[PDB]
Design an enzyme around this catalytic site. Sequence first.
Site, PDB file in Angstrom:
ATOM      1  CG  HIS A 108      -3.307   7.889  -1.397  1.00  0.00           C
ATOM      2  ND1 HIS A 108      -4.514   6.918  -1.522  1.00  0.00           N
ATOM      3  CD2 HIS A 108      -3.133   7.538   0.039  1.00  0.00           C
ATOM      4  CE1 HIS A 108      -4.878   6.225  -0.560  1.00  0.00           C
ATOM      5  NE2 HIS A 108      -3.865   6.490   0.299  1.00  0.00           N
ATOM      6  CG  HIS A 124      -2.155   8.410   5.109  1.00  0.00           C
ATOM      7  ND1 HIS A 124      -2.759   9.325   4.368  1.00  0.00           N
ATOM      8  CD2 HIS A 124      -2.448   7.230   4.387  1.00  0.00           C
ATOM      9  CE1 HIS A 124      -3.585   8.624   3.289  1.00  0.00           C
ATOM     10  NE2 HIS A 124      -3.308   7.483   3.509  1.00  0.00           N
ATOM     11  CB  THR A 136      -6.112   1.348  -0.386  1.00  0.00           C
ATOM     12  OG1 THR A 136      -4.930   1.771   0.024  1.00  0.00           O
ATOM     13  CG2 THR A 136      -5.720  -0.184  -0.175  1.00  0.00           C
ATOM     14  CG  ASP A 151     -20.689   6.773 -23.589  1.00  0.00           C
ATOM     15  OD1 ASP A 151     -21.356   5.969 -23.894  1.00  0.00           O
ATOM     16  OD2 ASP A 151     -19.715   7.080 -22.741  1.00  0.00           O
ATOM     17  CG  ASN A 206     -10.340   3.823   0.300  1.00  0.00           C
ATOM     18  OD1 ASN A 206     -10.578   2.680  -0.328  1.00  0.00           O
ATOM     19  ND2 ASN A 206      -9.260   4.279   0.876  1.00  0.00           N
ATOM     20  CG  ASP A 228      -2.121   0.783   1.131  1.00  0.00           C
ATOM     21  OD1 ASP A 228      -2.437   1.663   0.175  1.00  0.00           O
ATOM     22  OD2 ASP A 228      -2.890   0.960   2.013  1.00  0.00           O
ATOM     23  CG  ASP A 282      -2.465   0.301  -2.816  1.00  0.00           C
ATOM     24  OD1 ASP A 282      -1.537   1.027  -2.855  1.00  0.00           O
ATOM     25  OD2 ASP A 282      -3.286   0.270  -1.821  1.00  0.00           O
TER      26      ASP A 282
HETATM   27  C1  LIG Z   1      -9.338  -4.089  -0.930  1.00  0.00           C
HETATM   28  O1  LIG Z   1      -8.686  -5.112  -1.186  1.00  0.00           O
HETATM   29  C2  LIG Z   1      -9.377  -6.399  -1.071  1.00  0.00           C
HETATM   30  N1  LIG Z   1     -10.650  -6.596  -0.733  1.00  0.00           N
HETATM   31  C3  LIG Z   1     -11.263  -7.605  -0.672  1.00  0.00           C
HETATM   32  C4  LIG Z   1     -10.957  -8.937  -1.066  1.00  0.00           C
HETATM   33  C5  LIG Z   1      -9.509  -8.864  -1.552  1.00  0.00           C
HETATM   34  C6  LIG Z   1      -8.935  -7.654  -1.629  1.00  0.00           C
HETATM   35  C7  LIG Z   1      -7.442  -7.831  -1.946  1.00  0.00           C
HETATM   36  C8  LIG Z   1      -7.216  -7.946  -3.392  1.00  0.00           C
HETATM   37  C9  LIG Z   1      -5.933  -8.256  -3.783  1.00  0.00           C
HETATM   38 CL1  LIG Z   1      -5.780  -8.467  -5.561  1.00  0.00          CL
HETATM   39  C10 LIG Z   1      -4.687  -7.865  -3.160  1.00  0.00           C
HETATM   40  C11 LIG Z   1      -3.560  -8.282  -3.738  1.00  0.00           C
HETATM   41  C12 LIG Z   1      -4.804  -7.811  -1.796  1.00  0.00           C
HETATM   42  C13 LIG Z   1      -6.201  -7.601  -1.238  1.00  0.00           C
HETATM   43  O2  LIG Z   1      -6.520  -7.149   0.135  1.00  0.00           O
HETATM   44  C14 LIG Z   1      -5.334  -7.174   0.661  1.00  0.00           C
HETATM   45  C15 LIG Z   1      -5.826  -6.654   2.141  1.00  0.00           C
HETATM   46  N2  LIG Z   1      -5.545  -7.401   3.440  1.00  0.00           N
HETATM   47  N3  LIG Z   1      -5.812  -6.610   4.552  1.00  0.00           N
HETATM   48  C16 LIG Z   1      -6.403  -5.595   4.276  1.00  0.00           C
HETATM   49  O3  LIG Z   1      -6.662  -4.498   4.807  1.00  0.00           O
HETATM   50  N4  LIG Z   1      -6.221  -5.352   2.611  1.00  0.00           N
HETATM   51  C17 LIG Z   1      -6.349  -4.292   1.815  1.00  0.00           C
HETATM   52 CA   LIG Z   2     -22.929   4.515 -24.713  1.00  0.00          CA
HETATM   53 CL   LIG Z   3     -13.476   7.629  -1.864  1.00  0.00          CL
HETATM   54 ZN   LIG Z   4      -3.747   5.572   2.158  1.00  0.00          ZN
END
Ligand SMILES: COc1ncccc1-c1cc(Cl)c(C)cc1OCc1n[nH]c(=O)n1C
Ligand SMILES: [Ca+2]
Ligand SMILES: [Cl-]
Ligand SMILES: [Zn+2]
Length: 805
Positions: free
Chosen positions: A420, A265, A159, A683, A180, A121, A308
């Site tokens: 960010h 941050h 994130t 569009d 977020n 992150d 990310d």
């Molecule tokens: C917001 O990411 C997620 N949301 C829900 C399901 C999975 C992911 C997710 C997806 C990917 Cl591809 C990777 C590489 C990491 C992820 O989550 C990491 C994580 N663990 N703990 C925490 O707080 N985060 C953000």
């Molecule tokens: Ca369209």
């Molecule tokens: Cl947001």
């Molecule tokens: Zn942040």
Amino acid sequence: WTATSGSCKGRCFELQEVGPPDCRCDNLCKSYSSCCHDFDELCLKTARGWECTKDRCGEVRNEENACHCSEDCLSRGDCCTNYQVVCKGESHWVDDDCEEIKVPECPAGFVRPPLIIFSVDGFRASYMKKGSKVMPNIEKLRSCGTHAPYMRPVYPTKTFPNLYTLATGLYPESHGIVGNSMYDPVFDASFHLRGREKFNHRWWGGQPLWITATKQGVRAGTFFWSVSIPHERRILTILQWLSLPDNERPSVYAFYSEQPDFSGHKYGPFGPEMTNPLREIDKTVGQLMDGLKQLRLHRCVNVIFVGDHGMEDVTCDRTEFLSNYLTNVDDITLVPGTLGRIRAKSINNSKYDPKTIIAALTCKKPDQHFKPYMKQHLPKRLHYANNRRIEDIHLLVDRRWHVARKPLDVYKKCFFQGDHGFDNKVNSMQTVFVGYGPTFKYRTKVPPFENIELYNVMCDLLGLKPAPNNGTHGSLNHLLRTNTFRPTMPDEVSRPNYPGIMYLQSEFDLGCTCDDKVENKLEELNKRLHTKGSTKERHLLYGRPAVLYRTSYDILYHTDFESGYSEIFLMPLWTSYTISKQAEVSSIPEHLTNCVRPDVRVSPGFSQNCLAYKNDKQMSYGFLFPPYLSSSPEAKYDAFLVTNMVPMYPAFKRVWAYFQRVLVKKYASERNGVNVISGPIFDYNYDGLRDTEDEIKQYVEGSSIPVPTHYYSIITSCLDFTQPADKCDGPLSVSSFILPHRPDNDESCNSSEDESKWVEELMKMHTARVRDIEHLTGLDFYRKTSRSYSEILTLKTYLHTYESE
Ligand SMILES: COc1ncccc1-c1cc(Cl)c(C)cc1OCc1n[nH]c(=O)n1C
Ligand SMILES: [Ca+2]
Ligand SMILES: [Cl-]
Ligand SMILES: [Zn+2]
Ligand SMILES: *[C@@H]1O[C@H](CO)[C@@H](O[C@@H]2O[C@H](CO)[C@@H](O[C@@H]3O[C@H](CO[C@H]4O[C@H](CO)[C@@H](O)[C@H](O[C@H]5O[C@H](CO)[C@@H](O)[C@H](O)[C@@H]5O[C@H]5O[C@H](CO)[C@@H](O)[C@H](O)[C@@H]5O)[C@@H]4O)[C@@H](O)[C@H](O[C@H]4O[C@H](CO)[C@@H](O)[C@H](O)[C@@H]4O[C@H]4O[C@H](CO)[C@@H](O)[C@H](O)[C@@H]4O)[C@@H]3O)[C@H](O)[C@H]2NC(C)=O)[C@H](O)[C@H]1NC(C)=O
Ligand code: NA
Ligand code: NA
């Protein structure tokens, strides 16, 4: 209610989630209040820390320890990661020379190289060079493997949107995680980072990689780690899973670190306090690679080191307040910070007015640090509109700034020095990509690319068929040593007509006039050849675009330009012309100022008419091939054909005329000739995809002439600019844009000035990929080049960003 008094003995970090109210021992149990009573004791051991020491070598197994240094640990798969180093005189992975991994070197029983996604992150792209002295493990991955100078995140550069784009290959508007924080009015439910609703499946659309793998019989480890599980335990859990039996062992894994974001941050992207979180992340990487090396997996696993988003300098005093602009601040709800999203506080208030909110926020202060937009007017490259969770009113906030509703919001919450979320073309928001393993290339640098492309490649790495997504599959083949995906060009659906002269001038009653009756075998044969396609090799350098939907259109040839003319939309879908470095700009002659000429190849019934423009007090017209760039006084008459005309608001014509009269020639001088393809885009439902005829919301008054929402141009030249655009032997260079077709220039605060002070700025904001235009038009470009199709796919995903280095 969880009956939390079953046990986790033998179940620690089980891969399947078991059914309630039975207690859970999987990683997620922490997040859900649902772990068994003994989870901590059994599954989160910490005794004696994470490293072997000389005195523990050969120790008597003690099941209380965090990890083990006993002789049996290798076969148990639960050694501390530095076991072999401390106890068996082995070197750390980072201290070994790199050696090309030409083929996977895996233990018996491995059907495919595992993939491990190591996600960080807030890891800004410049940390790779700036932090290189304190990250030796990461630097070895980067230099030995395949790396990009940076990877572009999606907007908003937060994130949750970015990690779920990594997981799905989808834009946030399509996967549903658009911020977020979020409100979904069909649900009438809200989504927040802290909290519990976020776990409900109805937020999360698309098909993430772990679900794609599972459906296709490939097993997956945890992607979402509960925050209180320490990093060392995440690593050890991955290594333990890698020691499972073949039938139980996952093939895809993810690690996630909340650093360096969490520190960024507090301290800013380059705070002195930032060195330590980067050392610590590097140490975690070293732990994984030493663990892989112990398991003899370090020349078997493909590892992706990916961020990310980046991190910018942002402080409390750089906050604009809506209360300084709006007298009605209490009737609105704002999602604040590095972007703004506004909606009505109450849907029972029918005096809430989006139009006057926008106007109250538009160019109100001289250095205003955000810009309001209706979401459909946002740069099309952001793909940030087609979701009910994205509010109609959007604020794009300048880098280094915040927006908030009221000052009380900022001090009743200076703490932070970084943040960010900004526009994804901003340099500080760029993040990182390194691929290391048997399937990636050796010591190879690739150009920057967008994180929406990675899902396809991860599916390729795992032998999976990707679900439908927004990557362009094949555009990243150059990252890969093997497992490439061999894409084919889409088939053309509609073939064109090639009409000859079929109509007499007197059959047209379009209310158009031209001063053109001003009267030879040398040049009557000559101009017949031009209408037949004699100069087409000059103006159509990469073949004609393919039309990938069902429609009726004609190819029209001219001396200076070729077009694909739509009998349905009454205008070209595309117009192609080449301007050499030597070409001359002339002006529109006086006697031709209002000239429009019937096209005798095309029926009156399929033509635009001038009366409609006269009657439409808001709507004027422009031309796709610019008359200014005609090759001869006589070729100039072709540019006034009714088949080259398109509807244009007068405010937009200021933009378009400046592009055509000044900028095309400028680019041709700088790039050594350019090929230009221009056209309209429709569009109206802002989905990023071409409208069908029955979706058009606006026509030129009293006619069937549809009004484009946007105008595009694709500008191609030789990457080796010592060769002219029309005689290029090798790779191409492209830049493109999709300009919004608006009746005012409110978007541009300096528009009352000369076009030379604002127009090019506006075009840069609306930079686009060729792929964005393809989606919006149903056309497929670059069909006939001497380049490989994978290279052309990469070219079509290129975005010219206009950021510095
Ligand atoms: C917001 O990411 C997620 N949301 C829900 C399901 C999975 C992911 C997710 C997806 C990917 Cl591809 C990777 C590489 C990491 C992820 O989550 C990491 C994580 N663990 N703990 C925490 O707080 N985060 C953000
Ligand atoms: Ca369209
Ligand atoms: Cl947001
Ligand atoms: Zn942040
Ligand atoms: C980026 O890549 C993605 C993926 O390829 C592209 O998105 C696809 O676009 C397709 C065309 O717009 C779209 O196809 C439609 O599918 C409908 C079935 O939808 C469900 O099933 C899919 C497949 O499993 C699923 O993924 C969908 O999930 C969406 O919905 C929920 C919200 O409830 C979310 O959780 C999820 O995140 C996702 O939301 C997103 O997409 C929807 C649109 O589906 C948006 O509204 C959201 O804002 C959000 O972005 C679904 O659960 C199907 O119903 C459609 O069929 C209509 O149109 C066809 C044309 O073939 C027509 O012939 C039919 O008659 C039918 O019309 C009838 O219904 C109309 C509407 O109700 C009605 O008006 C008519 O009168 C008719 O009765 C359509 O085929 C596909 O769903 C999405 N997929 C995804 C994942 O988004 C995206 O286009 C790419 N972007 C770019 C720029 O290239
Ligand atoms: Na008019
Ligand atoms: Na303006």
